Design an enzyme around this catalytic site. Sequence first.
Site, PDB file in Angstrom:
ATOM      1  N   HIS A  23       1.888   4.387  -3.033  1.00  0.00           N
ATOM      2  CA  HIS A  23       2.077   5.816  -2.791  1.00  0.00           C
ATOM      3  C   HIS A  23       3.459   6.252  -3.251  1.00  0.00           C
ATOM      4  O   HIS A  23       3.600   7.256  -3.927  1.00  0.00           O
ATOM      5  CB  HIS A  23       1.986   6.173  -1.313  1.00  0.00           C
ATOM      6  CG  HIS A  23       0.604   6.154  -0.751  1.00  0.00           C
ATOM      7  ND1 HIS A  23      -0.480   6.703  -1.400  1.00  0.00           N
ATOM      8  CD2 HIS A  23       0.140   5.703   0.440  1.00  0.00           C
ATOM      9  CE1 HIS A  23      -1.561   6.552  -0.650  1.00  0.00           C
ATOM     10  NE2 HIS A  23      -1.209   5.950   0.471  1.00  0.00           N
ATOM     11  N   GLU A  70      -5.707   8.109  -1.780  1.00  0.00           N
ATOM     12  CA  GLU A  70      -5.968   6.911  -0.970  1.00  0.00           C
ATOM     13  C   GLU A  70      -6.966   5.940  -1.624  1.00  0.00           C
ATOM     14  O   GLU A  70      -6.792   4.727  -1.538  1.00  0.00           O
ATOM     15  CB  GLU A  70      -6.393   7.273   0.468  1.00  0.00           C
ATOM     16  CG  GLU A  70      -5.243   7.756   1.369  1.00  0.00           C
ATOM     17  CD  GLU A  70      -4.229   6.659   1.779  1.00  0.00           C
ATOM     18  OE1 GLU A  70      -4.286   5.512   1.273  1.00  0.00           O
ATOM     19  OE2 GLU A  70      -3.353   6.938   2.634  1.00  0.00           O
ATOM     20  N   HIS A 102       0.832  -1.181   0.000  1.00  0.00           N
ATOM     21  CA  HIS A 102       0.000   0.000   0.000  1.00  0.00           C
ATOM     22  C   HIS A 102       0.878   1.247   0.000  1.00  0.00           C
ATOM     23  O   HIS A 102       0.737   2.116  -0.858  1.00  0.00           O
ATOM     24  CB  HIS A 102      -0.896  -0.027   1.247  1.00  0.00           C
ATOM     25  CG  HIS A 102      -1.866   1.092   1.317  1.00  0.00           C
ATOM     26  ND1 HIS A 102      -3.160   0.983   0.858  1.00  0.00           N
ATOM     27  CD2 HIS A 102      -1.736   2.352   1.785  1.00  0.00           C
ATOM     28  CE1 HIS A 102      -3.785   2.133   1.027  1.00  0.00           C
ATOM     29  NE2 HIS A 102      -2.945   2.982   1.592  1.00  0.00           N
ATOM     30  N   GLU A 103       1.802   1.319   0.949  1.00  0.00           N
ATOM     31  CA  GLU A 103       2.725   2.459   1.025  1.00  0.00           C
ATOM     32  C   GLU A 103       3.675   2.537  -0.202  1.00  0.00           C
ATOM     33  O   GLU A 103       3.995   3.629  -0.686  1.00  0.00           O
ATOM     34  CB  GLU A 103       3.520   2.462   2.344  1.00  0.00           C
ATOM     35  CG  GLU A 103       2.701   2.395   3.653  1.00  0.00           C
ATOM     36  CD  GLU A 103       1.543   3.401   3.764  1.00  0.00           C
ATOM     37  OE1 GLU A 103       1.686   4.560   3.341  1.00  0.00           O
ATOM     38  OE2 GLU A 103       0.473   3.047   4.312  1.00  0.00           O
TER      39      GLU A 103
END
EC number: 3.4.24.69
Length: 418
Positions: free
Chosen positions: A226, A261, A222-223
């Site tokens: 980003h 997000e 997930h990070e």
Amino acid sequence: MKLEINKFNYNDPIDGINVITMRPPRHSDKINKGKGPFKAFQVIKNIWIVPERYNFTNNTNDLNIPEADAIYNPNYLNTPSEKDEFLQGVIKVLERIKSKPEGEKLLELISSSIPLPLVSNGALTLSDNETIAYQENNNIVSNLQANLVIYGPGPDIANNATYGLYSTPISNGEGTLSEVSFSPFYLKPFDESYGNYRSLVNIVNKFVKREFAPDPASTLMHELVHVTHNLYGISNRNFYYNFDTGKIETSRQQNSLIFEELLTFGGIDSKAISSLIIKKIIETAKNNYTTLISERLNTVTVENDLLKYIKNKIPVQGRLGNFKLDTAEFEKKLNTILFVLNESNLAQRFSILVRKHYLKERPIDPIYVNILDDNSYSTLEGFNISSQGSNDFQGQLLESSYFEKIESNALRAFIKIC
């Protein structure tokens, strides 16, 4: 060549190549006066791990006890043994991510996708947007390339986050070095509908909500998504998606979610985004990139390693001084990065259960898990270990013995693990 992960003990000697003492990238900000340098490890080319608490922005500066599902411990991650446990956990989670092709591509992407450098006397030249500095006795000995730095958690030892270093390059197409705050041992549980558990025979419906821990490789990925957006300078962090209107806004509202997000999480909610929005997002990135080729890249008259890095990152055609966005290839790559790469798509490729919606309906207390126990968590299969018959997400059930309860007081402070 094959993508490699390097192995380390926290106490490995400083070499100035893959083991350094790093000066924080935000050393110039007021809140960070006199902090560091910190010990740092080049796990993958241009990807560094710093076993230290993330402490370098306004909301992470104070680690003390003052979110309903936070947990606080100011002294966590401050002994060498805790730093080495952290270092091993993060390496293990990267080993897990590399074990599948989709995760290997992601990591390769982060290694090779340097931010667009500035130009000096006709040459792409590194700034502190593309490097970190090796500090030794108040001297900067060298500046070393870095696309990502992975630190421990901030105030809440079960929260995770990503920060780009400079806010103009994060959304104008240039890209920017990213910092990640990551906690592999302290995980926030989530609810999900499930019917693959021992149930009483008299029960109406077996398909009810059950508590799960996430696979911390999904958390990290997930990070890393980003980070991928931040490295391409296409972050959608300043926009909100309004669930009522189905439209992008700059101002937040009652039923909104930061657009970065929503894309980064994926799943059912990401699939409801209109063509209209998808077309403008593509367009905005094409224009930005067209501009940067014209205004910056065609000013380059000197061929170096940074040029090659940049040709591999950005699909372009033409020759030196006269480059052009290879529009078709760039649209493909942009699609891979905005819409194929998200937590939900990646989780499915790993047989990891993630929740249905990014925003969770209720808080559940965080837990502790020693993911360095190969019996509790394997690099190849996470908590869902087939030899134990866990092929439908059973290993992530919160009732599993290896998800340990934490005693915490009214103020959310750590006392002990039960």
